[PDB]
Design a protein around this ligand. Sequence first.
Ligand SMILES: Cc1ccc2c(c1)nc(CCc1coc3ccccc3c1=O)n2-c1ccccc1
Ligand SMILES: [Mg+2]
Ligand SMILES: [Zn+2]
Length: 308
Amino acid sequence: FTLPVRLCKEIELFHFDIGPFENMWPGIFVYMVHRSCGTSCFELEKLCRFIMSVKKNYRRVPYHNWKHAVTVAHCMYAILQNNHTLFTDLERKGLLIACLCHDLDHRGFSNSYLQKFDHPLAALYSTSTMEQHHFSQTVSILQLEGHNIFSTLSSSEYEQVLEIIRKAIIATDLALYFGNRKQLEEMYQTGSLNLNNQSHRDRVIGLMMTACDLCSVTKLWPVTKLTANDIYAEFWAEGDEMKKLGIQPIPMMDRDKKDEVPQGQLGFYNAVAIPCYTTLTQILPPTEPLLKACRDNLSQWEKVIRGE
Ligand SMILES: Cc1ccc2c(c1)nc(CCc1coc3ccccc3c1=O)n2-c1ccccc1
Ligand SMILES: [Mg+2]
Ligand SMILES: [Zn+2]
């Protein structure tokens, strides 16, 4: 497989939509891997077995699916390329694998669901429930025979890459974004943020995981609109099951209030999405097309509320 040349320069666009090229997404990740880290950074043998076993371990849920992991992975690719100068090979290796893997085996279900009804995984993992599991899956497949793509790493360089991926996967729990984005906002406007400080890198990386994770709000409006169907299809199913017992789900998961969606978008943009890309853009000025595309979509949703 080789990427049809009519992309190449289209893959480098922040707003790039992977949708129409489903049979290609395994080759795009290889492509995004090949371009970034160089080719021979893994054995092409064990990157494919890895890619394809990550794949098959995504469920046929409407949104937290294979298509989404590739959409997050792609967005890390675009962020990295435009920030070539200031990440390391061991980082640009783990972060792309971490993005492809960060929702592994998702069930179409919130952490709040899995705890409010004694779900066994929340018995395992009491905080960051689904995200501690995604990392769990990642480690399993890695250790499966002929799948350790990090075999060509020294001892202390292998346990390094594992840490980055773990941290990045955990940071995709939106409940930790809010504190992390606010810690990041203090330092930059006190002036005290130091990219040499390892723990600051972790915050920065965490936010880059957050920005990638929500990046269907940074696409061209037609694409960003259709993705929203998939997000609510899945919220509405989680609410439908909170309903089956007799419990009224938050209006975000209540299908009986689709009417309320464009308002909830705008507020979600104004409370989650715009602050995140706003911060990422101050740390990483090249990521500003993400912020610009987020504004554009927000005003789109405002026209939807305002009758236009
Ligand atoms: C009736 C109603 C009440 C609240 C709604 C709402 C509708 N729609 C939302 C936002 C739902 C949503 C969640 O995760 C995403 C992840 C990536 C990209 C977009 C989204 C997204 O739109 N919210 C919301 C969620 C969080 C904060 C503010 C609003
Ligand atoms: Mg998730
Ligand atoms: Zn996700």
